[PDB]
From a paper:
We elucidated the crystal structures of Act c 10.0101 and Pun g 1.0101, nsLTP allergens from gold kiwifruit and pomegranate, respectively. These allergens both belong to the subfamily of 9-kDa LTPs.
The crystal structure corresponds to a closed apo form of the protein. Both protein chains include residues 1–92 (mature form of the protein) that are folded into a compact, mainly α-helical structure that is characteristic for nsLTPs. The Act c 10.0101 structure is stabilized by four disulfide bridges that are formed by the following pairs of cysteine residues: Cys4–Cys51, Cys14–Cys28, Cys29–Cys74, and Cys49–Cys88. We have identified three additional amino acids at the C-terminal end of the protein and modeled these amino acids as Lys-Ile-Ser, which is consistent with the sequence that is observed in homologous Act d 10.0101 and Act d 10.0201, as well as in agreement with the results of mass spectrometric analysis of the sample used for crystallization.
Residue numbers in the entry: 1 to 92
The structure:
Amino acid sequence: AVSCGQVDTSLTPCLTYLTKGGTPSTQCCSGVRSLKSMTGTKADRQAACNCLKQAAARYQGIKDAAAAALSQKCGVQLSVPISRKTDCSKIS
């Protein structure tokens, strides 16, 4: 079980980067690592994906480019996309 509270809190330090781009903070990357360690089941990955979809929809300053590069720039293999347009049901 993962809540949007858990998911949104983990990426709270990433908002600077998500809205401006450049380089994520150490705490942002620690956040992305927390996200990966909490989404080991398909249910948790789909729940995470939905939470991050809803957050990207509400936070209008999020750059889609920055969202799609966040896991790559943190060195994290994160199996959850971050976009207001993703079909979260199609996630493995």
